[PDB]
Design an enzyme around this catalytic site. Structure first.
Site, PDB file in Angstrom:
ATOM      1  N   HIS A  61       0.176   4.241   0.556  1.00 54.50           N
ATOM      2  CA  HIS A  61      -1.218   3.995   0.208  1.00 54.50           C
ATOM      3  C   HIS A  61      -1.763   2.695   0.799  1.00 54.50           C
ATOM      4  O   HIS A  61      -2.969   2.429   0.727  1.00 54.50           O
ATOM      5  CB  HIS A  61      -1.407   3.992  -1.310  1.00 54.50           C
ATOM      6  CG  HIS A  61      -1.091   2.680  -1.966  1.00 54.50           C
ATOM      7  ND1 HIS A  61       0.195   2.240  -2.167  1.00 54.50           N
ATOM      8  CD2 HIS A  61      -1.905   1.737  -2.496  1.00 54.50           C
ATOM      9  CE1 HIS A  61       0.164   1.077  -2.801  1.00 54.50           C
ATOM     10  NE2 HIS A  61      -1.097   0.752  -3.011  1.00 54.50           N
ATOM     11  N   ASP A 103       5.009   7.731  -2.280  1.00 54.52           N
ATOM     12  CA  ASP A 103       4.336   6.531  -1.799  1.00 54.52           C
ATOM     13  C   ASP A 103       5.352   5.670  -1.061  1.00 54.52           C
ATOM     14  O   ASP A 103       5.884   4.703  -1.616  1.00 54.52           O
ATOM     15  CB  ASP A 103       3.719   5.772  -2.989  1.00 54.52           C
ATOM     16  CG  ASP A 103       2.663   4.755  -2.564  1.00 54.52           C
ATOM     17  OD1 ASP A 103       2.177   4.838  -1.420  1.00 54.52           O
ATOM     18  OD2 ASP A 103       2.312   3.884  -3.384  1.00 54.52           O
ATOM     19  N   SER A 116       1.200  -4.379  -3.691  1.00 53.75           N
ATOM     20  CA  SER A 116       1.572  -3.025  -3.327  1.00 53.75           C
ATOM     21  C   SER A 116       2.348  -2.953  -2.023  1.00 53.75           C
ATOM     22  O   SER A 116       2.021  -3.648  -1.075  1.00 53.75           O
ATOM     23  CB  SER A 116       0.325  -2.152  -3.234  1.00 53.75           C
ATOM     24  OG  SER A 116      -0.316  -2.051  -4.490  1.00 53.75           O
ATOM     25  N   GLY A 117       3.371  -2.095  -1.990  1.00 53.74           N
ATOM     26  CA  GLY A 117       4.187  -1.949  -0.799  1.00 53.74           C
ATOM     27  C   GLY A 117       5.247  -3.033  -0.737  1.00 53.74           C
ATOM     28  O   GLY A 117       6.165  -2.978   0.074  1.00 53.74           O
TER      29      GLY A 117
HETATM   30  O1  ME5 Z   1      -5.002   0.547  -7.696  1.00 56.37           O
HETATM   31  C1  ME5 Z   1      -4.589   0.953  -8.772  1.00 56.37           C
HETATM   32  N1  ME5 Z   1      -4.582   0.178  -9.875  1.00 56.37           N
HETATM   33  C2  ME5 Z   1      -5.124  -1.152  -9.812  1.00 56.37           C
HETATM   34  C3  ME5 Z   1      -5.107  -1.811 -11.174  1.00 56.37           C
HETATM   35  C4  ME5 Z   1      -5.467  -3.275 -11.078  1.00 56.37           C
HETATM   36  C5  ME5 Z   1      -5.175  -3.349  -9.599  1.00 56.37           C
HETATM   37  C6  ME5 Z   1      -4.243  -2.229  -9.140  1.00 56.37           C
HETATM   38  N2  ME5 Z   1      -2.940  -2.382  -9.892  1.00 56.37           N
HETATM   39  C7  ME5 Z   1      -1.817  -2.254  -9.094  1.00 56.37           C
HETATM   40  O2  ME5 Z   1      -1.865  -1.983  -7.888  1.00 56.37           O
HETATM   41  C8  ME5 Z   1      -0.551  -2.452  -9.671  1.00 56.37           C
HETATM   42  C9  ME5 Z   1      -0.377  -2.954 -10.995  1.00 56.37           C
HETATM   43  C10 ME5 Z   1       1.022  -3.033 -11.279  1.00 56.37           C
HETATM   44  C11 ME5 Z   1       1.838  -2.579 -10.162  1.00 56.37           C
HETATM   45 CL1  ME5 Z   1       3.623  -2.473 -10.099  1.00 56.37          CL
HETATM   46  S1  ME5 Z   1       0.895  -2.098  -8.836  1.00 56.37           S
HETATM   47  C12 ME5 Z   1      -4.086   2.307  -9.015  1.00 56.37           C
HETATM   48  C13 ME5 Z   1      -4.004   2.757 -10.417  1.00 56.37           C
HETATM   49  C14 ME5 Z   1      -3.690   4.145 -10.694  1.00 56.37           C
HETATM   50  C15 ME5 Z   1      -3.434   5.062  -9.575  1.00 56.37           C
HETATM   51  N3  ME5 Z   1      -3.002   6.401  -9.757  1.00 56.37           N
HETATM   52  C16 ME5 Z   1      -1.693   6.719 -10.072  1.00 56.37           C
HETATM   53  C17 ME5 Z   1      -1.293   8.100 -10.110  1.00 56.37           C
HETATM   54  C18 ME5 Z   1      -2.208   9.151  -9.836  1.00 56.37           C
HETATM   55  C19 ME5 Z   1      -3.578   8.873  -9.516  1.00 56.37           C
HETATM   56  C20 ME5 Z   1      -3.983   7.428  -9.480  1.00 56.37           C
HETATM   57  O3  ME5 Z   1      -5.135   7.087  -9.213  1.00 56.37           O
HETATM   58  C21 ME5 Z   1      -3.591   4.600  -8.190  1.00 56.37           C
HETATM   59  C22 ME5 Z   1      -3.899   3.213  -7.910  1.00 56.37           C
END
Ligand code: ME5
Lengths: 52, 234
Positions: free
Chosen positions: B42, B88, B185-186
């Site tokens: 992603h 992912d 992420s990643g």
């Molecule tokens: O960008 C996101 N959240 C954001 C929250 C605050 C910033 C980001 N928080 C994170 O990146 C991480 C928090 C803690 C970690 Cl570890 S990574 C995200 C949340 C949920 C999903 N998701 C999962 C499964 C199916 C569909 C779907 O949309 C995809 C991306």
């Protein structure tokens, strides 16, 4: 427990062959003569913090 | 990273940072060897053209150990979808080999059976990144690390509002205010065994950050060990 007993005394990977412990190392490491310790071949072996 | 601590000199040498055309980091990654980087699929959407920076611990200035590398081949898993976030995982083959030194070294790839039985049964794992220090805020200019406990699979499935597939696992705290965040992420999730750090996960996603009743979701690396192997050949 073999491998379940303190990783069978191995430094890294532990496998059970012929109902006995068999140790192995990650790439860049060489199994020592005791067949348990893992010796690095270079100055920056994987998995080690560069603390020096 | 929310909470946790600063990575001190040489403590997270396997950390990589994806930077966009503006030389600003949007995602993390893990060094696998002189030519390969592990990261999330992603992240390949967070920007068109990006490069990889290693040996960096403070974004503000340049200490002299950093190094920018160009990506030759991008290898994203073909089963990834933003609809589920399953599969992912991605591998980047760099154009030039990384030269190992202080703050620059690979993390170990473990063997599947041993890893699941010996690494993931340990109490905690280590996550790192230049991500946000608060759910709402700017990215960090300092590299940070945080010890996150492995979460019971059933417990996390229960706490999630999205399906936790077998290609993911949870790590973190129920209530405590420490967790990865936007920008990490990643990045790497490693597990220590006898002073040796093995790659066990990839920062994938979370519902908010450090929220109560919410954990961190990581890509389960032991599920892709062969995939990773093939990727490091083609
Ligand atoms: O960008 C996101 N959240 C954001 C929250 C605050 C910033 C980001 N928080 C994170 O990146 C991480 C928090 C803690 C970690 Cl570890 S990574 C995200 C949340 C949920 C999903 N998701 C999962 C499964 C199916 C569909 C779907 O949309 C995809 C991306």
């Amino acid at each position: 427990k073999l491998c379940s007993l303190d990783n069978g005394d191995c430094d890294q990977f532990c496998h059970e062959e012929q109902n006995s412990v068999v140790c192995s190392c990650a790439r860049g490491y060489t199994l020592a003569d005791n067949g348990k310790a893992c010796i690095p071949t270079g100055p920056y072996p994987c998995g080690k913090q560069t603390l020096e | 990273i929310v909470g946790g601590q600063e990575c001190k000199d040489g403590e997270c040498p396997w950390q990589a940072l994806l930077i966009n055309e503006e030389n600003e980091g949007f995602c993390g990654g893990t060094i696998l060897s002189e030519f390969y980087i592990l990261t999330a699929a992603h992240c390949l959407y967070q920007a068109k053209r990006f490069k990889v920076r290693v040996g960096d611990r403070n974004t503000e200035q340049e200490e002299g150990g950093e190094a920018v590398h160009e990506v030759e081949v991008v290898i994203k898993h073909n089963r990834f979808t933003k609809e589920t976030y399953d599969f992912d995982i991605a591998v980047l083959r760099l154009k030039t080999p990384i030269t190992f030194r202080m703050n620059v070294a690979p993390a170990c790839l473990p063997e599947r059976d041993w890893a699941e039985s010996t690494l993931m049964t340990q109490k905690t794992g280590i996550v790192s990144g230049f991500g946000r220090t608060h759910e709402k805020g700017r990215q960090s200019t300092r590299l940070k690390m945080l010890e996150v406990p492995y979460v019971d699979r059933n417990s996390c499935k229960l706490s999630s509002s999205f399906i936790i597939t077998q290609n993911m696992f949870c790590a973190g705290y129920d209530t405590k205010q420490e967790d990865a965040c936007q920008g990490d992420s990643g990045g790497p999730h490693v597990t220590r065994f006898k002073d040796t750090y093995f790659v066990t996960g990839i920062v994938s996603w979370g519902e908010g950050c450090a929220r109560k009743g919410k954990y961190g979701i990581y890509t389960k690396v032991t599920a892709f060990l062969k995939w990773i192997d093939r990727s490091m050949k083609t």
